[PDB]
Design a protein around this nucleic acid. Structure first.
Ligand SMILES: Nc1nc2c(ncn2[C@@H]2O[C@H](COP(=O)(O)OP(=O)(O)NP(=O)(O)O)[C@@H](O)[C@H]2O)c(=O)[nH]1
Ligand SMILES: [Mg+2]
Ligand SMILES: [Mg+2]
Ligand SMILES: [Mg+2]
Ligand SMILES: [Mg+2]
Ligand SMILES: [Mg+2]
Ligand SMILES: [Mg+2]
Ligand SMILES: [Mg+2]
Ligand SMILES: [Mg+2]
Ligand SMILES: [Mg+2]
Ligand SMILES: [Mg+2]
Ligand SMILES: [Mg+2]
Ligand SMILES: [Mg+2]
Ligand SMILES: [Mg+2]
Ligand SMILES: [Mg+2]
Ligand SMILES: [Mg+2]
Ligand SMILES: [Mg+2]
Lengths: 61, 205, 614
RNA sequence: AAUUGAAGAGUUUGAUCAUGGCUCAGAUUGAACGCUGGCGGCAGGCCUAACACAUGCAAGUCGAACGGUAACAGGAAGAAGCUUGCUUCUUUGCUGACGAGUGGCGGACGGGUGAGUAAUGUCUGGGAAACUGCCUGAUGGAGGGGGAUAACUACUGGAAACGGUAGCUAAUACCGCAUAACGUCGCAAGACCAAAGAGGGGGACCUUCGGGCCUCUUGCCAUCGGAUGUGCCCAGAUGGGAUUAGCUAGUAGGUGGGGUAACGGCUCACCUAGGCGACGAUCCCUAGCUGGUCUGAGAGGAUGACCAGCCACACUGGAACUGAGACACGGUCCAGACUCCUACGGGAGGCAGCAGUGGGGAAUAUUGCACAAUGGGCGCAAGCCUGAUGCAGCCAUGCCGCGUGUAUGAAGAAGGCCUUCGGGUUGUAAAGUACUUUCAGCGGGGAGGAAGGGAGUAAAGUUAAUACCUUUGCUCAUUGACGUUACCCGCAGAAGAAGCACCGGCUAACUCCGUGCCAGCAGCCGCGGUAAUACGGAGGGUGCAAGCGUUAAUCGGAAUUACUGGG
RNA sequence: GGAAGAUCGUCGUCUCCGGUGAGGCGGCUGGACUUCAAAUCCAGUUGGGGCCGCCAGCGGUCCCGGGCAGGUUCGACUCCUGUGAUCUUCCGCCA
């Protein structure tokens, strides 16, 4: 079981995502994170700084 | 690579005269160097050890306009070199061609030196060099290309050179604006502001 | 010569093709199994002449109509097989309506099952077909009576297909490709096959795959079952491409195209022509080349309709698409993509006239170029995208005279002049509003004039006026040439009482304000303007003197190079009696001026007139 | 001269000192993922499925070994056209050459991969009982005969694959015979063992006028030396597990036979009962080893990607032949699974070669150019071959270098943010003015990688010989894939080019707004419950920079396996 | 791509429901109460669109809504007919 970061997500029934390490230290037994922005896990929108994390393209303007 | 931004906010982060932009003046002083390093620049901040030695290292590496990875290269060779690591570090860092161009005096600022050397104007031993990192060997003359001569910038800088009082380890004629480099300086003949051992232990972690 | 077979089910669509081309269209096992054409099959007819016609066989079933709309793209000629069994049937009508909305130029009716019904029925069906064709706007049509089983009228039908002309497209166009079947051939790569709507491609080209959104190098290609180094529009192009994407990821309805496209847009305007009236804000199925989407239509003015997509889609200007009933069954209306980026304020009275201007008025890109200019500034990214214009084609705007081309958007000479006038009069208003200022700055001008526009165009336009000489500026302050930085009486009234005062000994700002009962900030600014006039000089911030003492300050500095040869403080007290604070501020005033310069212990004299003749 | 080298921090408590974990600061990588991305150099680039493979190429060469003439170019008798000296046609291996065939040499090198292997391997150091093609030194021979056979011809089998029947022919193919000891055997006496020619030139002379003869080059057989390469033995070193303690019947020794290039239970007959093992036998799990790479003050720890040496393997499992060398990647034979054709008899195939495709995976490239250089095969040589190699393509994967301007510029503009509403900050930053043009773009010039090889010529050497051939000079013409090369010279315009992370402590860098233990952040300790420097946005700063972050891995710190260096 | 199938109100889920909806459970907001919770009683918990003036984390109007339409019926979340979003299963992709 892998944690999901950021505010809001599109993940539902069978979704193919890819996971990276790191542990949350609150929910014992989740040793992983899912990356935002790779395969079927969409980069959280409505976010500006720290956006290489969370995988959202830059605003044009 | 290069910085490309406000010079004298970098000059006023350390509150020193960093020589970054001189031209008609030396220090601007009308630009409020000590009073505004940033929005919270006005309030003085206590500096912890890592901050004093890192702040110093940032200072010197800005005054000579070098980035950090080739500055770390300069350090690893400096250590590998025989003799005191601080002294010969600084000395080999002054061997940089752009620094020399500034010390011979023909140039406005070391960034202008970067300009002039990058633009094919410099000539060493009858060969042209673009590289600002080129370490000038001792007892070697360096000139500026004959067609590069007649540029307005070089003399208007020569005037500045006479004003700054010149260095004693280099002999510059400046009749043809061709000077000769002599020997690598020693820590005692220059600066008395940078404290280099702060850098050497900062990299001794 | 792409020729698509259409007609109702089991009216001999495929059998005709095998007769003409000796190619069994059905390839899928199930169609073999069930005796039908579940999905689109392709047949080709190479000729010794060296030109190969392209044959696209589409189903007739209403259920598989969504498939037929993918293959009706880019047809040069369409042949509707009608079988004399029941003759014209409703589905035949549906195929005709679909071909009408796609605006195919011409069609050949070929009548099958001649053997099955006697000649009378041949004449009757002939009459009925000739009557139906008039309904859907195809007047001239060539009716052939043939039975593919015996090949009776196959020969007569053959010459006509070769006689068909090939409908050409403009020489300069961005290559645009409609993906149809993404299938991996075992040998060498990913080969995605699709109809090339426009342009040419060669083996070295780099393309941008959509939905994967990744560039892909063409490994190899087949023009129409023929290996070649180049591929031109008007034919199915098998395209073997390298890159990051793969077949499973590719979904029919992806575009391959030469350059990164702007973000897909949900809203769009369409010319509207329909067989049955529509209704405002109603759900429908939008069918675009190899694409199925559901969006809700709106009605604006006359034959102008608005499509809103719940699924974003890449469209280009002048793209015919079909709008069908949302629950299917009925083809009701047609569509053309006219504007790619409609904003709000749709039904406002001035704009509908404009929409008429943009669409009915122009059938070509150059005319469109003028229309958009009338509307405002024209972004080359958007215009290139809408018109699919190549570099050579794009440069043609540049060739037309009177076009302002800044960093991005084009501007017509009339509209440019209009903006110039607006900017000038706005300039004049600001000029009048502050009469104590040297002028407005460049950027402030752009913000006070047209904040919503592109910066490069508006500023370049400003440059145009600068060069014309309508605006003369000094020190980077742009004021009308007429301005003299004279001032207003409101300042002079203080400056009259301030005059004797200033004369017999000048004093500091805060003291001045205290002496004349005027606000400190007001007093400092009015005197700064007085100093811009040349009446008083600040040797240091907030300290103002007359001129007659400035020259006297130079008289005291005059004796230093000649009597000493150095500059030091001591002589302040030992020469006239002028204080140290005063003398030092004098020096910094002259250092900024350039009368003296400071280095270590002494001041230099590189550029002043302090020097006497001898 | 070859070293010069060792740092700490946070968290147990109300506070303290100890013990002890966890976490961080460093360096590194064949890395991947997110955002961003201008250029150049030099590197590197299936770590997973030793999983399956479409298509193309990756081993040929010698007519100076031979019989020949399939294809081409000459020449020849002739055809004899007509343009009467240009052209038309048969015949002609007779010359240059050469398909197919026999023969020689190569294919046992070069290239790939790490499945197996805990020793049959590898490294270090010794040794006796060996063999070694082409290379090199010496000593000598190289005489004299025959019978076939492929190609070819006539027939025939079969779709193909490949054969079969009959007849003919050559060889540096093969077999006799003669000869031969410093060679083999044997204590000795004695007995026994081999060969092959071809090419270039040539005065006299032979001339079945085919050729013999002279000279040179090169080839062949024998024995001993050298180099080289390889086989075999031995001692030590090279993982983990005792929650594996017994193991071995050809295995432990002998005598004799056999076998090998050679010692050897290598193998067999008979005899004896040995032999290995708490210094870990046997069994199990994992594994290619090494020079070295990373790290560390060091001692150690991890590791074995690139480069070089050795080993093993070639669809899986076996076997042998030819050979100096194989139990053989692109050889043979049988079996097996899987793919393919077929006329249903039968065949065919093996990318862990270079590309490339499918699959697996977080992930790893072009179905390119050249033999110009180095090297290799064959050849007298020219040459031909060469996916070795040289280069190019792709990818920020790494390391390194450069640029994205420089100088001046204050009523310190506007906008943004903040305010104590006085102002501060962004900020010399922008604007303006005066300059440059690096790289990129456009156009010209322009090295080096090229040594030799070929033709001619001169001398010397050789020889019967002013010839051939060899050597070394001299003259000529020429050999570049990269390549639109590096580099240089002109043109125009600052013109075409800056991000990413962080800002509570550790750890460099703080303020306002939104939310209100919700939404979220988190390497650790923690934040958020209506005044959040920790969340989200903004403004400002800081650190790195064509990169910045995150994740994974190793060492360090960790004296936290303590030999140095603990209890 | 085809065929078969599941689900998709009004904050979430289940039971339904031809009288214009009902009921349970939970969640959220507000009240009593505190630093905020938990607990115990109370009160509430329709959304989305088009057109028009700011973009204002709006203001009016009109409409539609058990995924999106239609038909039935006096009246449909419920009956019936199409089709879409995500998604399960089988089949096939061959320039
Ligand atoms: N007598 C006759 N029958 C024909 C002819 N052409 C087709 N058919 C009938 O059509 C059947 C095959 O169908 P097809 O020709 O493919 O009709 P189609 O319209 O192409 N099939 P679909 O519409 O589903 O694609 C045959 O069984 C045959 O009976 C014709 O020329 N003559
Ligand atoms: Mg059909
Ligand atoms: Mg049917
Ligand atoms: Mg609707
Ligand atoms: Mg505590
Ligand atoms: Mg041999
Ligand atoms: Mg004999
Ligand atoms: Mg072997
Ligand atoms: Mg092979
Ligand atoms: Mg995969
Ligand atoms: Mg070949
Ligand atoms: Mg760098
Ligand atoms: Mg250039
Ligand atoms: Mg002689
Ligand atoms: Mg954070
Ligand atoms: Mg240790
Ligand atoms: Mg201890």
């Amino acid at each position: 079981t892998s944690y999901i970061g950021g505010e809001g997500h599109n993940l539902q029934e069978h979704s193919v995502i890819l996971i990276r390490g790191g542990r949350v230290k609150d929910l014992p037994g989740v040793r992983y994170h899912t990356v935002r922005g790779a395969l079927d896990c969409s980069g959280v929108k409505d976010r500006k700084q720290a956006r290489s994390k969370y995988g959202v393209k830059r605003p044009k303007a | 690579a290069r910085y490309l931004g406000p010079k004298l906010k970098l000059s006023r982060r350390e509150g020193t005269d960093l020589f970054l932009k001189s031209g008609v003046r030396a220090i601007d002083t009308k630009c409020k160097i000590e009073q505004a390093p940033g929005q919270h620049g006005a309030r003085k901040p206590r500096l912890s050890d890592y901050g004093v030695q890192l702040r110093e290292k940032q200072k010197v590496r800005r005054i000579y306009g070098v980035l950090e990875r080739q500055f770390r290269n300069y350090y690893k060779e400096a250590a590998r070199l025989k003799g005191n690591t601080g002294e010969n570090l600084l000395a080999l860092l002054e061997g940089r061609l752009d620094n020399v161009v500034y010390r011979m005096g023909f140039g406005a600022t070391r960034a202008e030196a970067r300009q002039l050397v990058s633009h094919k104007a410099i000539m060493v031993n009858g060969r042209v060099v673009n590289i600002a990192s080129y370490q000038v060997s001792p007892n070697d003359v360096v000139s500026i290309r004959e067609k590069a001569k007649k540029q307005s910038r070089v003399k208007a800088a020569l005037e500045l050179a006479e004003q700054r009082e010149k260095p004693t380890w280099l002999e510059v004629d400046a009749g043809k604006m061709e000077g000769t480099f002599k020997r690598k300086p020693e820590r005692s003949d220059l600066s008395a502001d940078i404290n280099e051992h702060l850098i050497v232990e900062l990299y001794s972690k | 010569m792409i020729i698509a077979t259409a007609g109702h089910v089991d009216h001999g669509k495929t059998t005709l093709l095998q007769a003409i081309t000796g190619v069994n269209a059905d390839r899928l096992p199930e169609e073999k199994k069930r005796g039908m054409t579940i999905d689109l099959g392709y047949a080709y007819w190479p000729q010794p002449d060296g030109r190969v016609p392209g044959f696209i066989d589409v189903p007739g079933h209403e259920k598989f109509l969504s498939n037929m709309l993918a293959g009706v793209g880019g047809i040069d000629h369409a042949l509707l097989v009608v079988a004399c069994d029941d003759g014209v049937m409703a589905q035949t009508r549906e195929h005709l309506a679909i071909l009408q909305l796609t605006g195919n130029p011409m069609l050949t009716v070929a009548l099958t099952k001649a053997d099955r019904v006697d000649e009378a029925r041949v004449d009757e069906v002939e009459r009925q077909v000739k009557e139906v064709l008039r309904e859907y706007g195809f007047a001239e049509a060539k009716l052939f009576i043939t039975a593919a089983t015996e090949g009776r009228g196959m020969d007569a039908l053959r010459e006509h297909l070769l006689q068909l002309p090939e409908r050409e497209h403009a020489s300069q166009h961005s290559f645009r490709l409609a993906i149809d079947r993404a299938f991996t051939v075992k040998g060498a790569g990913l080969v995605v096959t699709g109809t090339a709507l426009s342009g040419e491609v060669k083996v070295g080209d780099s393309l941008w795959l959509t939905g994967v959104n990744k560039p892909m190098r063409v490994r190899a290609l087949h023009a129409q079952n023929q290996p070649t180094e180049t591929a031109n529009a008007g034919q199915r192009i098998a395209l073997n491409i390298a890159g990051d994407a793969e077949k499973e990821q590719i979904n029919r309805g992806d575009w391959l195209l030469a350059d990164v496209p702007p973000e897909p847009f949900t809203r769009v305007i369409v010319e509207l022509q329909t067989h049955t009236p529509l209704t405002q804000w109603q759900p429908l199925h939008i069918h675009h080349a190899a694409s199925h989407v559901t969006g809700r239509v709106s009605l604006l003015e006359d034959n102008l309709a608005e499509l809103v997509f719940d699924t974003p889609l890449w469209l280009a200007d002048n793209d015919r698409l079909v709008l069908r009933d949302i629950s299917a069954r009925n083809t009701l209306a047609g569509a053309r993509v006219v504007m790619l980026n409609p904003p709000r304020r749709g039904k406002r009275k001035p704009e509908y006239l404009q929409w008429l201007a943009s669409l009915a008025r122009a059938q070509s890109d150059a005319d469109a170029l003028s229309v958009h200019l009338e509307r405002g500034a024209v972004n080359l990214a958007d215009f290139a995208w809408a018109r699919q214009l190549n570099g050579e084609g794009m440069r043609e705007l540049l060739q037309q005279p009177g076009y302002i081309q800044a960093g991005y958007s084009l501007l017509n000479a009339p509209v440019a002049a209009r903006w110039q006038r607006k900017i000038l009069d706005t300039l004049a208003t600001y000029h009048e509003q502050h009469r104590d200022e040297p002028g407005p700055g460049r950027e402030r001008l752009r913000r006070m004039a047209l904040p919503m526009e592109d910066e490069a165009l508006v500023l370049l336009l400003i440059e145009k006026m600068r060069e014309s000489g309508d605006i003369h500026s000094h020190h980077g302050w742009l004021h009308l040439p007429d301005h003299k930085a004279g001032f207003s009486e409101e300042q002079q009234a203080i400056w009259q009482k301030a005059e004797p005062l200033f004369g017999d000994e000048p004093w500091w700002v805060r003291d001045l304000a205290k002496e004349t009962g005027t606000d400190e900030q007001a007093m400092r600014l009015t005197l700064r303007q007085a100093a811009q006039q040349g009446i008083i000089t600040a040797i240091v911030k907030d300290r103002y003197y007359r001129n007659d003492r400035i020259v006297e300050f130079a008289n005291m500095i005059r004796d230093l190079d000649q009597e000493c040869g150095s500059t030091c403080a001591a002589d302040f007290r030992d020469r006239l009696g002028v204080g140290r604070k005063l003398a030092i501020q004098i020096l910094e005033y002259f250092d900024r001026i350039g009368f003296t310069r400071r280095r270590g212990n002494d001041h230099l004299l590189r550029d002043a007139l302090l020097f006497p003749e001898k």
